[PDB]
Structure formats: C-alpha cells, structure tokens
C-alpha cells in the first residue's frame, strides 16, 4: 500500500531509507555543503538559535529526500529514530520542520534501544549504543525500557577523535615538501575518521593491562604503518599511539567509569527479577562497536570487573552472552525502525499525526502530564 | 568573416578545423585539428590559453572516438583543456576545466571552475557540474543561464571588433 520513510539522525552519520528493505538505501554524513563557506557545518547540534536550527534541518531534509528516497514523503508515514535523551528542544524543532514546512501525514519519535531490540526479536535485553557524542546504556525488560537504570559517559567517537588529535600532536613525524613536528596546529575530522577505521587496532585484555602498567612505571609496541595525506605531506604515524588512543575508552582508574563498567552500573540499578535476563541478553550497537576486535575486549573487561570484590557481592556468577544482530553494528537501530514501520499499519496509528499536532502543540515526550 | 581569430592564437589543420559565424578565439589558443576535425558553433567564445585538441585519430578498427564538437552560444572559459567533448548549445564551461574521452555535455549545462569531466561522462540537461570527481551539484535555472550567455556574447563582439590582428 505505502512503504514508510525511516530516518536515524546523528552528529557523525545519518542512516536513512525505506521501511521493509533489509538495510538502508544510503548513508550520507550529517554535515552539509554550503556555497561560499570554508568548512562544512554539522546539522545535528544542541544549545543554539531556534530559527537557525529550523533552517539547518530544512536544508538537510531537502538534500536527503531527493538523493535518498526519490519521492515526496507527503504520500506516506515517517519514522524519525531519535536516540533517547536527545534534547526536547531538538525534537520540537524536528516536529516543526516535518509538519510546518514539508507537511507530512505522520511522524514518530521512538527510541533507538527498543527498535534495536526488535531486530533481535527478544522482549528482554541489556543494550549499549556507542555513538559519536555519547556511549548510552539502557536495559529493556519485556518491551518496556527501564529508564532510571541507565548510564552515558562522554566516551564515544568524539572522545577518540580528541585523543588522536592530542597524541599525534605530541609525537608527530611529517615528511618534507625530514623532521618538522607540530607544523599544522589541527587536522580535519573526515581524515581523522578514516584513520580510526583503517589504522586503530583494538588490543586484548592482557595487552591493555600491560599498556596501563607501562603508562605508570612498552610491551608489544608493533605494528606501525604510515598514513598518506594530501599536499605532499605524508606523516609516519606510530603503532603504540593508536593502541594508547583505544585504551582510554576502557580506562577505569580515578573515575571508576568506562564502557565496560557502565553496563555493570546499569545492571546494579535494575531489580532482582529482571537481573538475569538482562545479563543473558547483552546487545552491543552503534558506531564505535564497528572497530576491529572490539567485542572481545569488552566481554573480557566485563568479566574482569565481575571478578572484582565490589561487584561479586551483587552480581556474582552470571552468563554474559552477546547475542549479535542480523545487520551491522552501526545499522541495528535503523533496521528496527524499518521493521516497526513496514509491517504494521496498525502501530502507525499510535504515533502522532498532522491533525493532532496543529490543535494540540507538540509530540508527547516522556515527561509530566 | 565574423569570427575574430587572434594573431597569437593557432589553428592547426584548417580544413579539419571549423569556425561558425560570430565566433571569438582569444589569444594563445590552440585549435589543433591535425588528426581529426574540430567543429565550433555559432556565437561560441573560446577564451585565452584554451587547448582545443583532437580526441582520436579516427583510424581505430573498432570503437573510434568522436573528434570534437561545440554547440552554439558556447562560453568556453580561459585555460580550459577541451578534448573529445560534444558540447551542447549554450554550454558554460568553467575556467581551468578538463573534458574527457567521449564526454556528452547536454544543453544548458554549467561546468564549474577547475572541474574534471571523466571519459564517457554523460552530463544531464539543465544541471550544474561539481566535485573533484564529476557529479551532479544541483539543477540550474533556464532564464538566468540564457541571460548570462547573451551578455557574454555582446561583450565578446566588442572585443572582436577592435585591437586584434
């Protein structure tokens, strides 16, 4: 009858396509290309002028639906996959742009973790979404997301970018156009993403502990490979640096916090009957989880933290299984929204319509009244 | 008669070369039609330092490339390496451009400055070319492009009249 639209906005990338198709049609990055502009500006931003955001969202949606969808969304429904705890200011702006400017029939602002759970096809699961800005945890038990049990450290893609920028600046080796360290003050983000995808090798638990021991009073430094760059300035990036950048994601000491500890804190907050099913079904999604050799380092670190005396008195013996999804780790949240929209013309009714928005005021966020 | 060919410009292969009425070949131009023919449209303005080279020998046993072409009101910008491109009428080539092997430029096109049109790149009608690797930037306006081409043709005719021999 009518295949609905699926959107999954974010600061780094944006998964978008049709509901029903196994995986999206395209994934253009969040930034936009403007005429007479030095650098490309990011679309998804927080704490900034309302009318400017509205114009930025219109500009991104306009370049999206022609290239991605090849259709007017005026014919059929939309599924805007907002991550839970995405600012209400930003949701209101999205609601305005979809109804006032474009005039869609319906919209939906559903959470990312519940839809990622629909892909697995199980009702209870602990979920971790390691995106660009934050690494958010949220356990779901029998459909309902357990909200007060949660956690989100500023330790996703953006933290890894900042650490790469710091460590490369400290130890730099650029070719002539050899020596000459710290010539350029900063480096672009698109290049630094390509370095993370290709170079950064994720270490094991025993290797990670050896690196942590070396930092505070050297084993397994290799391997190292150079990275090519434009304008005839190749830089000889090292092997110990990229491993040290990955290590800060799992660094426990002096914060009592990490990607692994965040699941345990979420499990601690959850009730006793819910506890065991969440431990059995531990789902990992998001952008940072696509890194090579990540799921072992997490599961081994999780287990090491359970062996510690502080978590034995509550958790103890637990079968931590990581049931992986059908689609890739970044594109699990989108696939869930595509499942939610395509199949059920019935569950399209619960979402907010154009008729309801004009008279009322806004889509209902999880708040009072 | 009306075609204002400059003194510094060179037109190798006069029989193969072809210049329509109201043309304008700027200084230091190179219309090399030794191997193959070169067809220029009416009111076409070839800017300075433009290398109009022939695409192929046309002696290949199978799949010989198309020599050269240029539609009417063609605004060829300066330093533009035009080679093996069938330019549709009213095509606006950018400055420091580069055309590929058998590249089909459509009517009312707008090639950007410092562009590189690849081999067998069929550009669509009423569309701005963009990117380091050739791609569709956005749809161009019909009225604005026609008015700019008319203004460029009038300005080229004034320079064609005086100060070149």
């Amino acid at each position: 009858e009518k295949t609905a639209v699926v959107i999954d906005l974010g600061e780094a990338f944006t998964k978008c396509g049709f509901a029903g198709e196994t995986g999206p049609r395209c994934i253009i990055p969040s930034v936009i290309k403007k005429a007479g502009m030095p650098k490309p500006i990011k679309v998804v931003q927080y704490n900034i002028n309302t009318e400017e955001l509205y114009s930025y969202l219109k500009e991104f949606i306009h370049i999206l639906y022609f290239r991605h969808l090849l259709v007017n969304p005026r014919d059929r429904r939309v599924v805007v996959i907002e991550s839970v705890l995405c600012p209400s200011h930003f949701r209101e702006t999205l609601t305005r742009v979809l109804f006032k400017y474009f005039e869609v029939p319906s919209v939906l602002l559903a959470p990312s973790h519940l839809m990622a759970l629909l892909t697995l096809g199980i009702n209870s699961a602990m979920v971790l979404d390691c995106g660009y800005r934050e690494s958010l945890v949220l356990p779901i038990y029998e459909g309902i997301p357990v909200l007060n049990c949660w956690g989100a450290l500023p330790l996703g893609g953006k933290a890894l970018h900042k650490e790469l920028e710091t460590q490369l600046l400290e130890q730099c080796t650029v070719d002539t156009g050899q020596s000459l360290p710290s010539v350029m003050g900063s480096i672009p983000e698109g290049v630094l993403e390509d370095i993370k995808v290709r170079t950064c090798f994720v270490s094991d638990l025993t290797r990670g502990l050896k690196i942590q021991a070396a930092k505070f009073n050297r084993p397994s430094p290799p391997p190292n490979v150079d990275y090519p760059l434009d304008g005839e300035k190749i830089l000889h990036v090292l092997g110990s640096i990229r491993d040290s950048v990955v290590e800060i994601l799992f660094e426990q000491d002096n914060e009592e916090k990490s990607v692994a500890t965040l699941i345990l804190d979420s499990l601690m907050q959850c009730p006793i009957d819910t506890r065991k099913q969440l431990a059995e079904n531990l789902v990992i999604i998001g952008g940072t989880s696509m890194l090579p050799g990540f799921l072992h380092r997490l599961l081994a670190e999780i287990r090491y933290l359970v062996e510690k005396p502080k978590y034995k008195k509550t958790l103890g013996t637990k079968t931590f299984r990581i049931h992986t999804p059908p689609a890739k780790a970044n594109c699990v949240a989108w696939l869930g929204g595509a499942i939610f929209g395509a199949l059920q013309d019935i569950l399209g009714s619960r979402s907010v319509s154009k008729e309801y928005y004009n008279q009322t005021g806004r889509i209902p966020d999880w708040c009072s009244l | 008669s009306g075609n204002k060919v400059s003194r510094q410009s060179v037109l190798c292969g006069s029989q193969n070369i072809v210049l329509n009425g109201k043309t304008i070949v700027m200084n230091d131009c190179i219309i090399r039609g030794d191997l193959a023919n070169v067809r220029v449209g009416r009111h076409c303005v070839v800017k300075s330092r433009s290398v109009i080279r022939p695409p192929f020998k046309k002696f290949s046993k199978g799949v010989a490339f198309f020599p050269l072409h240029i539609g009417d009101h063609v605004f060829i910008e300066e330093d533009c390496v035009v080679n093996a491109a069938q330019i549709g009428s009213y095509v606006h080539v950018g400055k420091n451009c580069v055309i590929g092997r058998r590249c089909v430029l459509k009517d009312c096109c707008k090639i950007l400055d410092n562009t590189v049109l690849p081999p067998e790149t069929v550009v669509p009608p009423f569309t701005v070319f963009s990117g380091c690797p050739g791609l569709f930037s956005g749809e161009l306006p019909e009225c604005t492009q026609e008015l700019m081409i008319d203004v460029t043709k009038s300005y080229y005719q004034k320079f064609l009249p005086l100060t070149q021999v």
Partner: protein
Amino acid sequence: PGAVVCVESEIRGDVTIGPRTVIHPKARIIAEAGPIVIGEGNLIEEQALIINAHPDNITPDAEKPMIIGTNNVFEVGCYSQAMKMGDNNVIESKAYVGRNVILTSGCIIGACCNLNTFEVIPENTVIYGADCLRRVQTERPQPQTLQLDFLMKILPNYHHLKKTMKGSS
C-alpha cells in the same frame, strides 16, 4: 634520430631522447641545469613543461638529471620538474611532479595531481586525481601482467596515433 620532434616544440640544453619518442606541439624541454634523458617510446604531449633541478652541491646535493622511463605516457599540460620515473608510467593531464621523486614502474597518475617532493611512489599504484598520496586503487594497476599489458596496449595506441599524425603532417 627516429623521434617525432614537432616544429612548434622547444628544446634547450642537453637532451638525449630514446627511439620512437613523440614530442607534441608547444612542449617545453628545458634541460639547462642537467642533461635530460627520455626513454624509448615515451610520448610527451602538448603544453608540457619538462624542467630540471639545479644540482651538484658538495654537502646534500639537491638533484641529478631527470631520467624518464620507456613507454611513459606524459599527458597534455603535465609538469615534470626533476622527477625520476619508471617504465610504463601514465601521468595524466594537468599533473605536477615534485622537486625530487621516484615514480616506480606500472604507475598511473591522476588528473590535476600534485606528485610529492622527496617522495618515492611504490611499484603498481594508481594515484587519485585530487588529494595527494591516495593509497586506494592499486589492484587493476598491478606491477605487471595487468599494468604491463595495459601500458603495452597504451604504447601501441600512442605509437599508432603518432604514426597517423606523422602521416597527416
């Protein structure tokens, strides 16, 4: 003898060209600093600027004579100011070789590509046109069989096209 040197093309200083070499119209071959060396079957296209680096300093000498390899297809408007080149190297149009270089055999430089000063390009690797030193796209340009056969076909088409141009006159 036995090299298609055009009348409009300019040569200067010492320049020893190989057999079946094709110097196109308005091609600059300024070899005043050092003795230029062109390989056999090397096609220099129109508007090309062949320069040399001033050399012979006692401590850290700057350069030596730019030796171009055999079957090297230099495209139109290509800059080659002091760069060591290998056999079967296809430099695209509007390119720019660095002040010192070591372009290996079976190469394929992109259009509008700035080749690096003091940078040796590896054997079998096609350069992307825009941002310099792009590692991607080096399979179809293999070091041989794939690129050696393609360069042999390119040398045959260049020789056939030059023979047709020489026949026309």
